[model samples]
Target chain A: GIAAFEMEYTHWLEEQNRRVSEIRTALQAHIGDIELKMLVDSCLNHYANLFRMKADAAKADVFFLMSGMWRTSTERFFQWIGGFRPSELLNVVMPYVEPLTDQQLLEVRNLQQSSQQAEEALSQGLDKLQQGLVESIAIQVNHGAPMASAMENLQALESFVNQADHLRQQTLQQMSKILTTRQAARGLLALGEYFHRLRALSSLWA
Target chain B: GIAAFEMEYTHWLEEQNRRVSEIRTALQAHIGDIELKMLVDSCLNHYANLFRMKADAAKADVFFLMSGMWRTSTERFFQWIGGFRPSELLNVVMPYVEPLTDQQLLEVRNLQQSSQQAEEALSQGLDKLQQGLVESIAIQVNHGAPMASAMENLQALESFVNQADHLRQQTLQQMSKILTTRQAARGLLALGEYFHRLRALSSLWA
Candidate 1:
């Protein structure tokens, strides 16, 4: 079963790579702003699908997912278990919107505050869940209780993952709401370029 | 300054690698538990120095530190910005402990609860700081306030890093208090092995 999931994940990686290339091409071709926006949204949907795929696999063995054997070591190194922190999206986006206009600056400034709040809320939730796990594990280890079984672990993991993905999607959506189509396109490209560089470092090290 | 710090970091990495090897040797040589415990404590002190080094560097440029251009990509991937979550030490240490004695089990159980509570408090502190940064950024970007300058950012980052390192140290110390010297030695070995395997993955991918 793990092997099958690995195969599936590898296939997903290929698709993601291809999508990255597509994003690059569309930007270079100077696609219409509307078309570019559409492309960006579709790319996000593709990523959402990848998240769902991971969620499904976690049902069978969350540890296998967390162990990150299926991903490249580079990917594993950046693993926040499921995805990037919901708040980090701000840092990831900051570089793309340089020399902001008065209105753009205001929008981003507001975004910074909102994103920080959302980030704090999500982080608080994760801490609660982590604490819960510690309690659960303690009970299981001490009393041999079935209450803290794998089922409970899976449930907690799924809750976190689902909420994390929601916040990720919402962050992007919020960005889109504020950004012009071209600005949004540029932001998406920047995001792709950032991860691409990080992933490429593996080859450099080798 | 960055280059100097990188050189220092490289030197530190070498020392860490040597420490990993020493840990393996000690385990194989059947060293006395008292000696092993001392070694483990010293190794942790070495790590504390690293946190201090990083905090010093962050004062100069937190973004450079965050960009993670100095460390190998593998290390960057596992980064929790400053260090591992204080709570995650539980997960990292769990596998080493198996078939626990009733007393040992109880101690670890209580440890779990205490660690969880501590984890929540630290996380809460982080969230507050993060929110503060966001508010600072919004005011800076919108009204050009100097309040969110790099100085403030550096202060926030250093605070988080220091607090994080403190929790990490406290968690380990608490573990050592609960476990026998041999068990503590074994736990430290497990940590070295875990990161060793993780670091080795970069080569396989290459």
Candidate 2:
């Protein structure tokens, strides 16, 4: 699965770059109302795709290095840019989002840290779960005569998917609190990105 | 040519429909701010794809149905729906697009009229131009000589491509006028949609 995605990744990357160039041109022109809307849309989608690519590392069914060195490097790269570049462009693209007040900024920052921390544990948990799943499969094959331990693994896998769902929502909820004002949707885009990158980083550190 | 695009088209349509369903799911959940940003990206891409399809019809080299009764009926079906239905859903999907005001409404409606008229001529010109291109090739094949008439055809083709570019811009510009606020991007998405539908219809009518 990982190799499949990687092959597709080359073309996807080119498309992403092309869209970015087109977006840059549209933004520069700010030609007309309709054109600007497209620019805004392009900008947001570019960021989303960036976030999605980084998150792709989390899928245990796909191949990935155990070291997670790749995820770690990407997390740093994404989180840094997620903070600066996209944040700045979004401000210009969607001015309706009001300026962040000092109080509002403080509140959102607080939530960001909390979400980041929560995400840290969640990613660590995912790694442990994936490791256990692999071991359980091997154990089941060799010890089919006595499979008590393997059943436990099956239950754990089912429960973990549910827990992951919950944690994912928690992450989203935390991000939403920060988006309450003019910065609602725009800020959320960046926040979601941070969480996505953090998930990969969490595995490395955990 | 149509077959070439069909396999891609089949997959593309499924992806689009799948995305639409996903968008609806996300909207219903109204989970977090980041998720909505993703939704906005999906919605915008939908419009962009629709626009791209219409542009594709003008490729001249592609096989197409000529009657344009197909185009005309589709124009009606897509235009009104594009103007109304998709436009409505987009509002709930993207709140920043605020409700259309009376003046904003009129400007866009007027623009729509002008664009409609411009399209009327544009389609006719495309047909005339297509016919000449076919003849130009046949003449070249039969005589195997660079005839004087072919030069006139060549000039005509050059002029038509330029005119088509102008008309395309006019369509986009007219699309811009309708987009004062929430009405802007949504309308353009619909406009792109109608054109896409018309492309298929163009062949049916011709």
Candidate 3:
């Protein structure tokens, strides 16, 4: 079952990567102006920064939950569990340059498109899992409780876990896509250094 | 000159207080509905939190500036100076908390009126300062540099400083008004405490 789940995950990840590569290929063909290039670079950097932060926070939460140390009362922990912290996410992303300029709007559109694609991919993956082993495990976890109460709590927890897992996977996949896109956009050999760092950090989970 | 500035500051502060009081009086006329009251209370608390954070950041900036240790490159310092940490502001405000339940919408209308009035007051204050001491200081600061560069830098810095100051004053004024208008809006009393702490810390500059 675990192998099957891994296979499904890998397949979804690969498809997402393909979409990202297509976007990168398109972006690479038009790096004519410095302003346009910088704009694309800025958005790419912003996306990568946000992805890393999301991944780090998710990894942290998983550790806490697995270790039985997840504290619900703290704002930080609650924020981590509650999906994206937009303010923190923006803070991490914004300092890469001045505020989004007019030239960046095109790149912003691309970023938005990329994000939507990633979101859709994760949502589809979660929807697939919902009807399979994930649902079975959720049911078993709530087997002995009063039907209504157990169903409510189980559904809530399952939703929370699924949302968290989907976000973590989406962010990781998106970051991987960003590195490929950035390299093609900039034609900078040092691009591999960033992907190397991402691969190293991600390998911990593998 | 110092005494004159102090007197002018006090008068301006009192006028701000009166404006806020007017808003509070209007809010009090609709205390019968709990949901409206909660919504108003939440918005007021949001503004209060905003003010407290702004005030604290301002105080920190002033302290560091006076200490001659303000490091423009320090990320933490930049975060503290920026008033609100990136995504934390939205997270703190929780805009998704159903901003317009019918009763809440009514309160919002009232709050919006109050915010407009506060905004006007802030604009007027900024205009007066710009025409008065702010311009004089600009002249002094730009005494030797080439006109264009000096004027541009001065304008940018002035905008940065005055914008931060205006937001701090307006948020604090609006919060205080909301507190008076609806006693329940005292959800921001903790924020008031934060302001008080900042004030105490700022006194070191004296």
Candidate 4:
């Protein structure tokens, strides 16, 4: 019999999988082929990047004395180099920028900040939950001889579950934000047009 | 030299005339010939009845006897006998009826009631102001030594002014209420359609 914690986690995982499937179905129905392809490519690149980072860390951990120092130094040097030229790069980029009005800039900044905070919180919470589940599976594998192979495969299944859930949630959140902002922009544009018409009317009367 | 009160009243009268013109223009744009003819007929009948009543009253007041009482009673009885039930007489007379939902009907009723109260209060205030001006005119007419003639003309002018002003205001209020109700009804209809579509989509998924 599965432990209570395992059962609850499994239920949550199933719910996450169902939600991901729903989102994927909705996206396929609503999105164009090109857009769907682009999204798939982006997700694939993200997964590849994650695995590459894991592999790099594994190599560094195994050859700590020789590879660790060089790898850490190289990453630090690149970070320093990237940080040093940001202002200069921004100046070059600034002239090409179509600056938003004060209100628009404020709205964009607020949305960006909120999105960043939500993404960070979601990442941290998911990471902690996955770590707990992995520990539980390891204990199960050691204790249950018949379920050892199943427990060993749990890590791979959990990783797939997490990726699918995170991608679907993030995509939905992004689409919702985009739709909201578009509507707000449209409203502002309409208000601007109304003011313009009022100005014309006033001028005609004058 | 016009007094301050006279100048203000003249300004108000001009504004009211402008609004009446605007309403006439809008009505012409929106209504067909048949609708316009019906409105005209209603107004004509109302005025004709008013004048007939006035003539009968004048004749009775002059006689001032038991014979006059008998005549008046006979006239009133004949008028009552001649009167037809409005709905029965004009069963096919189609007036515009703006449809609204329960919620929207409540909103429109509240708006109309509030506007009516405000209009009544405003009319009372204007009446008080007009009384002061009429007193001033009476004083001037007395000093001119043609008090009776001036007073009679003033009374006639006051009646015409009051009728015109009251009719215009009532028409505008009723039309505004009708338009608001119409708009609210349209919005509610659109919302009902939207929800119907949403229900259909949900049912399909279920």
Index of the highest-TM-score prediction: 1
DockQ of each: 0.04, 0.01, 0.01, 0.00
lDDT of 2 by residue, A29-142 (tens): 545646655544554555455445534533422113222223332232232211222222233323333466677567655655664565566557756876665443323233
lDDT (10s digit) by residue, model 4, range A1-206:
12332344345435434433433553547655455444444433443443343333322221121111222111211111111112222222222222445664454445555545544555566457546644543232235443454344334434433443454344334423433332322322332233233333323222
Residue-by-residue lDDT tens digits, candidate 3, A55-159: 444333322322112211112221333343322332233333224456553454455466556556655664564345334432334353434543443354345
TM-score of chain A of 3: 0.34
Candidate 4: which stretches are off by over 4 Å?
A1-98, A137-206, B1-206
Residue A203, model 3: lDDT of 28
Ranking by lDDT: 1, 2, 3, 4
Show where candidate 1 strays beyond 4 Å: A1-206, B66-78, B97-101, B139-150
Best by lDDT: 1
Measured against the true chain A, the candidates' chain A TM-scores are 0.78, 0.44, 0.34, 0.28
Fnat, model by model in order, equals 0.00, 0.00, 0.00, 0.00
Off by over 4 Å in 3: A1-57, A61-116, A119-190, A193-206, B1-111, B114-165, B174-206
The lowest-lDDT stretch of 10 consecutive residues in candidate 2 chain A is A79-88
Native contacts recovered by candidate 1, as a share? 0.00
Error in Å for residue A38 of model 2: 69
lDDT of 2 at B125: 76
In model 4, the number of clashes is 0
Worst 10 residues of 1 chain A by lDDT: A138-147
